[PDB]
Design an enzyme around this catalytic site. Structure first.
Site, PDB file in Angstrom:
ATOM      1  N   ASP E  80     -36.839 -12.474  64.388  1.00 49.97           N
ATOM      2  CA  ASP E  80     -35.930 -13.596  63.975  1.00 49.97           C
ATOM      3  C   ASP E  80     -34.506 -13.203  64.028  1.00 49.97           C
ATOM      4  O   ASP E  80     -33.694 -13.529  64.927  1.00 49.97           O
ATOM      5  CB  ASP E  80     -36.246 -14.088  62.601  1.00 49.97           C
ATOM      6  CG  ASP E  80     -37.617 -14.714  62.633  1.00 49.97           C
ATOM      7  OD1 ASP E  80     -38.299 -15.203  63.520  1.00 49.97           O
ATOM      8  OD2 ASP E  80     -38.269 -14.545  61.424  1.00 49.97           O
ATOM      9  N   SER E 105     -28.750 -13.744  61.244  1.00 50.86           N
ATOM     10  CA  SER E 105     -29.929 -14.103  60.522  1.00 50.86           C
ATOM     11  C   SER E 105     -30.254 -15.439  60.548  1.00 50.86           C
ATOM     12  O   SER E 105     -29.514 -16.279  60.182  1.00 50.86           O
ATOM     13  CB  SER E 105     -30.185 -13.643  58.786  1.00 50.86           C
ATOM     14  OG  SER E 105     -31.552 -13.872  58.211  1.00 50.86           O
ATOM     15  N   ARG E 106     -31.532 -15.695  61.190  1.00 52.97           N
ATOM     16  CA  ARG E 106     -31.846 -17.289  61.770  1.00 52.97           C
ATOM     17  C   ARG E 106     -32.649 -18.088  60.670  1.00 52.97           C
ATOM     18  O   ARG E 106     -33.368 -19.024  61.089  1.00 52.97           O
ATOM     19  CB  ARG E 106     -32.666 -16.971  62.883  1.00 52.97           C
ATOM     20  CG  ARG E 106     -32.116 -16.312  64.159  1.00 52.97           C
ATOM     21  CD  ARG E 106     -32.706 -16.179  65.373  1.00 52.97           C
ATOM     22  NE  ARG E 106     -32.327 -15.518  66.458  1.00 52.97           N
ATOM     23  CZ  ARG E 106     -32.636 -15.262  67.696  1.00 52.97           C
ATOM     24  NH1 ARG E 106     -33.670 -15.834  67.998  1.00 52.97           N
ATOM     25  NH2 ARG E 106     -32.257 -14.380  68.363  1.00 52.97           N
ATOM     26  N   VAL E 107     -32.497 -17.757  59.397  1.00 55.48           N
ATOM     27  CA  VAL E 107     -33.158 -18.598  58.165  1.00 55.48           C
ATOM     28  C   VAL E 107     -32.058 -19.106  57.541  1.00 55.48           C
ATOM     29  O   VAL E 107     -31.753 -20.304  57.462  1.00 55.48           O
ATOM     30  CB  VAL E 107     -33.867 -17.678  57.311  1.00 55.48           C
ATOM     31  CG1 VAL E 107     -34.673 -18.496  56.176  1.00 55.48           C
ATOM     32  CG2 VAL E 107     -35.019 -16.940  58.231  1.00 55.48           C
TER      33      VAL E 107
END
Ligand code: ATP
Ligand code: ATP
Ligand code: MG
Ligand code: MG
Lengths: 50, 170, 526, 487, 140, 112
Positions: E80, E105-107
């Site tokens: 991710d 960070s892909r969240v």
């Protein structure tokens, strides 16, 4: 003068890296062709010996 | 020969050199004496001062380096390169007899300015020359000074006042 | 006689043999004699013995005239060549065949001496050049590499080193001579002929020999030539004698072995090379050594030549060979184009062992000039034309680089006394362009003897036997020092009075052109 | 009992195949042929199986005059080499045979060369600084007793000289038996090392010798270069385990061990990986590295050198070798060309013990600030190389004039390189190494010029050299004044 | 997962000794599918399956701070986000030597805390503005 | 005296292999096949032996429409090219066949 002194070194390392990446791709391809030659089997060669 | 000599590595060597010194003395061409030394180092019998002095005697008494002549051969450069071999390679230092042969060689060859260097080298090393030899040296010097042979002629030739590659002899 | 088999197939230099009906054992790394014709017989070396009885072979002779149905014979012995004193003064095929112009067999493949058979080198080797004999000394046994770009003066250093030994070897005894060998891998036969004629002219051929593996020659033979030169050298090594060896060049030896490897489909590596080219060169350069007194104290010095590309010591082969040799001499194309010849770079050049072999007379002068040039390299770059300066460092440096500008081999006595003056400041008043003429007028001519001043007692130049006293006592000894200083002070005074005055007075263009002609002539002859 | 016998099948290089009639022995079993046929003794270890009734095996000595029907004899064991106090002060081959011509080694037992590494329960990593006296090695990358060291450098950078200086500092005053593996390096260097030690009485033959030498050099084949390191590890693991004693292990060098294994894999026919190394490189390197550990019984302080062809860190062999070591020392070429020696690159180098838990806080903070200053000097090089120092802020050029001083002070002469720098070698103690850097870092000494730091040791030696240079410069000024008045 | 480069060298060793064909940088080719099988097993499980979880922090060594190598790109493709550590910053003083320009960070907010949402949303703006100014040697 | 004849066995681009029944000719030896088959004359030089009866030969023209196992005549030597005064003012290909259309060339000898 300084810019030229850097530019010749930059061109030299650029061509060095170019030639090494070409040689590398070539040796990859030859490694694969060789591995495939190893993968292929030998035949029988049946003939009269007498 | 109670003393025992050793190599740099610590191994043993043999001081028995007499049968080789005899082959040196029997020679009649002073290059064969170096061929003997070549056949002598291989036998792990490294040379002694008593052997180098035999070699110097043999160079002094031999008529030529070889049966056939050689261009540019000097009996002196051998008798001084062997002393560079003595001092530098092997650690041994020459003696009054060694410089005696060298001075006799320079007297026979007729050189006197280098004989004077040999005299001053003896005196700097505490060696006493032979008066019979220094007298002959000064005699040859006086002769060459009288007859103008103290230098060559091409040195005393007047140089070109005008610059030219073919005038300077280049 | 034997008829072990027959030539199955050929691919350029490499070949394959198929056994006969009555298969007979043949050993490894053995030479085979291929019956090309009724009388002509080729020569070829085994390198692998396979399960099927098939044998891979490298061909060396008559590859155009080899066929398939030809028979093959076995010698049952290693690849050997003759060697001895008789081989001196000849140019040969690496297989022993003599190349015309207008008993003891030695093994080509052999192991190097171990540490106990070897020794630290003790005596120097004069290359006839002041840069080298001063600051990059060379012992008898110290193998040293020569780097630089194409057409820079690499072969010429080797040739001048060979030609320098002729003046000495005739004088001294034969035990202390330095014989020589020159292998030419991939070089032109024209250049090899010109080298043969050069050595024949200067009579250096009697103490030398040449091995010719040209670019038109096979790759196995170029791979084999340096081994054969080293084999001719090892007989004189193990027989107590001293001998030089040259390789022109290892880069083309590696190219020939690269041909053989790629034709055998061996796995390549960095810069197309297989990977055992380091072992290939270590087999060659470990056979060079200063032997022990237990083995005769002989020698085999090796000056290999290697070609760079655009002033690049970071090449794979260049650094593989620097990882083997006992030093380095680097010629720069920048300086070769900028007039300095030989074009040695003192920063990139070094001699790791030759300090022990350098004579004290030359050791001290080399120390002084090493310090002087270490200062000159820094004081010359820090200003970067910001502001000029008049200092003895930059002065003596500019007066010394002119002496380093050379064309041929120099005598040791000539080499010192030109440098001693620079170290002690005697060569400070004279000009840039008149340094070579100053040197020529110091050495070949004698101003005190010309102008009658004969106050000096012994120190002169016409004899040249004073070398073997300077070389043993040193100029800084109490008897040589005063006469030396007097001769040099007289020479400076007479030069500055008679010659340089007239020179600065010369204004006619034809006179100045004739004078530049003279200075170039003095640059050549000195 | 009766010995098994087998017969050669084919030969491709140093690699050989052998047909064993009854059955094949395990891998790594040694196999000997008498010297009557080949002319010399030849022991040959099994390395792999091809099929049943066949074994592939590498030779140690050369395969010259080897035939296809020679009787090979099963020894029934791996390559065994001697151990004990009789192995002290002796030079050894790949086979464990002594070559120094002295006499028969009086061994009691022989151990094999291949051995499993110690267990995690046996391993005990104690972190203790090893004061070498070398000044970059102390500040930047302080060595560890019982740890590993890597001297990663090309041809002509000074790793052999660093090795000689470390030997002269540590080994003579070590009080523990040392081991020296020469693996594909100069026989010249091995000769000079044997003579430097027989003269320093480390290989005193009439007394107590503190050294073991093992030498497979570049003349030796790859079968030896590939199996001399194992023989040295056997000699060192015996003194680690049996004697229970601290030891030193100088390896020069493992890059030719790697080259040898690659040259062998080529003959074996294995498919190569990237740039041309062997496929089993990581495994062979881990099997070599993890044997070098400090157990409860003793400790091995290794110093492995590594070669970098074409000055390339991205070479996979060094790139893998970095992760297996405790103290990396990455040398450079441009630094050597700039007159600095040792040609260390502190920005690329690194260490594991470099934490305040092990080294004191002042030595830590000083080293951190030096490395930061040099990282800034490196960032400013991209400007200085183009425009000049005159186009930089006052702060920037002060940082430059101080980082240059640090870099020149990092250079120093060694007793080994006295032949080259023409100066005696200094031994800088740690407490005098830290105060000098702290003074040069806090601006406590900025009036001193740059050149007073080049090739010196200790701020006292600095101030002496600066006084000497001031004296010489003033004497040159009075000299030029008198020459001008007389002119 | 400590270094996956050493697991790719091991997989290459395995495949080449088993006489698989090489590929780019001598890898067999399906080392992407290899790490994909390894890393897609990471998940935040459904409440139907207990609302369990397994986080994964694989580590990959880097050579000369390049993100162009084969395995590096093959793992950046899979994972991710990434925590890029720059040797220029480790050597330049700061520890942890995180390079914010290359580490993302892909969240985002959904993972972090209510109290961290309002701080992270201010720090993102603050660091985006400081990235544009911090090049200036401080004059004012 | 007679002349040697071989038979094609494979064609891959310029490369062609030629089985024989006798001793294979040397390397660089020329092998001609008549122009009736290909439409134009066709020469191939041996480069690389594969066994006791096969001869790999590189082809200098287009090998299109060349059937398998066609007869192939060994020239007895390598490519003999014209030489002389008559060569001047003309153009010649590798085989010495003039392409300038300016009639034949009246040469005396023909060197390899
Ligand atoms: N010291 C020198 N002074 C003047 N000319 C030189 C000097 N050294 C070399 N040359 C000239 O350079 C040319 C080539 O020299 P040389 O044959 O030594 O090149 P090389 O190093 O062998 O390179 P290559 O072998 O690739 O031709 C010759 O014309 C030679 O006269
Ligand atoms: N501390 C030093 N001071 C002065 N000169 C040095 C120093 N270290 C190395 N050198 C010089 O660097 C050159 C090579 O040294 P060295 O023999 O250590 O090479 P190396 O590092 O062993 O590489 P290789 O093992 O490939 O030869 C020599 O000329 C040596 O004088
Ligand atoms: Mg040349
Ligand atoms: Mg070294």
């Amino acid at each position: 003068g300084n810019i030229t002194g850097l530019m010749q070194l930059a061109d030299y390392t650029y061509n060095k890296t170019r030639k090494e990446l070409i040689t590398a791709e070539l040796l990859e391809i030859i490694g694969t062709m060789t591995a495939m030659h190893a993968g292929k089997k030998v035949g029988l060669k049946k003939t009269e010996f007498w | 020969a109670g003393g025992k000599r050793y190599d740099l590595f610590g191994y043993e060597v043999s001081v028995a050199t007499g049968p080789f010194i005899e082959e040196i003395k029997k020679a009649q061409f002073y290059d064969d004496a170096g061929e003997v030394i070549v056949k002598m180092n291989l036998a792990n019998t490294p040379p002694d001062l008593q052997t180098y002095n035999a070699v110097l005697e043999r160079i002094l008494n031999c008529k030529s380096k070889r049966s056939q002549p050689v261009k540019g051969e000097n009996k002196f450069a051998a008798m001084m390169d062997i002393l560079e071999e003595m001092d530098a390679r092997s650690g041994i230092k020459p003696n009054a007899e060694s410089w005696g042969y060298v001075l006799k060689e320079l007297v026979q060859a007729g050189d006197f300015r280098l004989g004077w260097v040999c005299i001053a080298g003896m005196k700097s090393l505490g060696i006493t020359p032979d008066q019979a030899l220094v007298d002959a040296n000064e005699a040859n010097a006086a002769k060459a000074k009288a007859a103008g042979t103290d230098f060559p002629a091409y040195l005393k030739k007047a140089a070109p006042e005008s610059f030219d590659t073919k005038a300077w002899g280049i | 006689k034997q008829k072990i088999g027959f030539v199955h197939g050929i691919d350029g230099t490499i070949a394959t043999i198929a056994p006969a009906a009555s298969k007979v054992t043949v050993p490894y790394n053995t030479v085979l004699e291929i019956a090309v014709s009724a009388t002509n017989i080729a020569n070829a070396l085994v390198f692998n013995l396979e399960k099927d009885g098939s044998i891979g072979v490298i061909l060396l002779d008559n590859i155009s005239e080899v066929r398939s149905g030809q028979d093959v014979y076995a010698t049952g012995s290693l690849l050997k060549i003759p060697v001895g004193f008789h081989m001196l003064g000849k140019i040969i095929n690496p297989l022993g065949k003599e190349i015309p112009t207008g008993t003891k067999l030695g093994l080509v493949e052999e192991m190097a001496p171990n540490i106990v058979s070897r020794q630290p080198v003790n005596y120097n080797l004069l290359t006839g050049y002041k840069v080298i004999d001063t600051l990059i000394p060379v012992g008898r046994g110290q193998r040293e590499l020569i780097l630089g770009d194409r057409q820079t003066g690499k072969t010429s250093i080797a040739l001048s080193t060979i030609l320098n030994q002729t003046k000495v070897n005739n004088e001294i005894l034969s035990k202390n001579n330095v014989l020589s060998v020159y292998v030419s891998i991939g070089q032109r036969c024209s250049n090899v002929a010109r080298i043969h004629r050069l050595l024949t002219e200067y009579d250096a051929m009697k103490y030398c020999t040449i091995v010719a593996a040209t670019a038109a020659d096979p790759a196995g033979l170029q791979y084999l030539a340096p081994y054969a030169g080293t084999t001719l050298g090892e007989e004189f090594r193990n027989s107590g004698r001293h001998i030089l060896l040259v390789y022109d060049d290892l880069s083309k030896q590696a190219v020939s072995y690269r041909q053989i490897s790629l034709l055998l489909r061996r796995p390549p590596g960095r810069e197309a090379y297989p990977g055992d080219v380091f072992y290939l060169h270590s087999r060659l350069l470990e056979r060079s050594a200063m032997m022990s007194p237990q083995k005769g104290s002989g020698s085999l010095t090796s000056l290999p030549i290697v070609e760079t590309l655009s002033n690049d010591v970071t090449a794979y082969i260049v650094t593989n060979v620097i990882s083997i040799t006992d030093g380095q001499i680097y010629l720069d194309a920048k300086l070769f184009t900028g007039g300095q010849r030989p074009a040695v770079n003192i920063g990139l050049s070094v001699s790791r062992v030759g300090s022990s072999a350098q004579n004290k007379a030359m050791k001290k002068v080399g120390g002084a000039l090493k310090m002087l040039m270490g200062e000159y390299r820094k004081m010359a770059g820090e200003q970067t034309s910001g502001s000029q300066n008049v200092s003895p460092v930059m002065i003596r440096g500019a007066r010394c680089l002119q002496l380093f500008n050379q064309k041929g081999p120099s005598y040791f006595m000539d080499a010192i006394v030109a440098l001693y003056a620079v170290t002690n400041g005697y060569m400070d008043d004279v000009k840039l362009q008149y340094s070579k003429f100053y040197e020529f007028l110091l050495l070949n001519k004698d101003l005190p003897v010309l102008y009658g001043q004969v106050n000096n007692k012994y120190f002169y130049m016409y004899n040249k036997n004073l070398n073997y006293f300077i070389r043993y006592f040193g100029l800084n000894h109490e008897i040589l020092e005063p006469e030396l200083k007097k001769y040099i002070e007289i020479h400076t005074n007479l030069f500055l009075d008679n010659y340089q005055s007239r020179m600065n007075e010369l204004k006619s263009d034809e006179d100045l052109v004739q004078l530049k002609n003279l200075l170039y002539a003095c640059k050549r002859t000195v | 009992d009766v010995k098994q016998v087998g017969y050669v099948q084919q030969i491709i290089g140093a690699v050989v195949d052998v047909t064993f009639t009854d059955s094949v022995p395990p891998v790594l079993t040694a196999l000997t042929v008498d010297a009557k046929e080949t002319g010399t003794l030849l022991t040959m270890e099994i390395v792999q199986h091809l099929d049943t009734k066949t074994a592939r095996c590498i030779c140690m000595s050369s395969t010259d005059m080897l035939r296809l029907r020679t009787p090979v004899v099963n020894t029934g064991s791996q390559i065994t080499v001697p151990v004990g106090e009789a192995t002290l002060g002796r030079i050894f081959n790949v086979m464990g045979d002594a070559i120094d011509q002295r006499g028969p080694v009086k061994n009691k037992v022989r151990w094999p060369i291949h051995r499993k590494a110690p267990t995690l329960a046996e391993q005990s990593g104690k972190d203790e600084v090893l004061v070498t006296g070398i000044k970059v090695i102390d500040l930047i990358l302080p060595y560890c007793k019982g740890g590993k060291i890597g001297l990663f450098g090309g041809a002509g950078v000074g790793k052999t000289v660093i090795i000689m200086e470390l030997i002269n500092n540590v080994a003579k005053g070590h009080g523990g038996y040392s081991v020296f593996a020469g693996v594909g390096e100069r026989t010249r260097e091995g000769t000079d090392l044997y003579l430097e030690m027989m003269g320093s009485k480390v290989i005193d033959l009439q007394g107590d010798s503190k050294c073991v030498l093992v030498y497979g050099q570049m003349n030796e084949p790859p079968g030896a270069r590939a199996r001399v390191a194992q023989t040295a590890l056997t000699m060192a693991e015996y003194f680690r385990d049996e004697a229970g004693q601290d030891v030193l292990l100088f390896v020069d060098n493992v890059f030719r061990f790697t080259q040898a294994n690659s040259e062998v894999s080529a003959l074996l026919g294995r498919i190569p990986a990237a740039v041309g190394y062997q496929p089993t490189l990581a495994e062979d390197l881990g099997m070599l590295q993890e044997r070098i550990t400090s157990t409860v019984k003793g400790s091995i302080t290794s110093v492995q050198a590594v070669y970098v062809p074409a000055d390339d860190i991205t070479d996979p062999a060094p790139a893998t070798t970095f992760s297996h070591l405790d103290a990396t020392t990455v040398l450079s070429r441009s630094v050597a060309e700039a007159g600095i020696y040792p040609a260390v690159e502190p920005l690329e180098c690194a260490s594991r013990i470099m934490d305040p838990d092990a080294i004191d806080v002042n030595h830590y903070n000083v080293a951190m600030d030096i490395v930061e200053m040099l990282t800034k000097y490196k960032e400013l090089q991209d400007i200085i190389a183009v425009l000049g120092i005159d186009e930089l802020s006052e702060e920037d050029k002060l940082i430059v004039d101080r980082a240059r001083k640090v870099a020149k002070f990092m250079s120093q002469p060694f007793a080994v390189a006295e032949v080259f720098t023409g100066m005696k070698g200094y031994y800088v103690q740690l407490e005098d190494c830290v105060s000098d850097f702290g003074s040069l870092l806090m601006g406590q000494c900025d009036n001193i010029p740059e050149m007073a730091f080049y090739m010196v040791g200790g701020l006292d030696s600095v101030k002496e050299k600066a006084a000497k240079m001031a004296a010489e410069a003033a004497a040159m000024r009075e000299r030029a004044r008198k020459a001008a008045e007389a002119k």
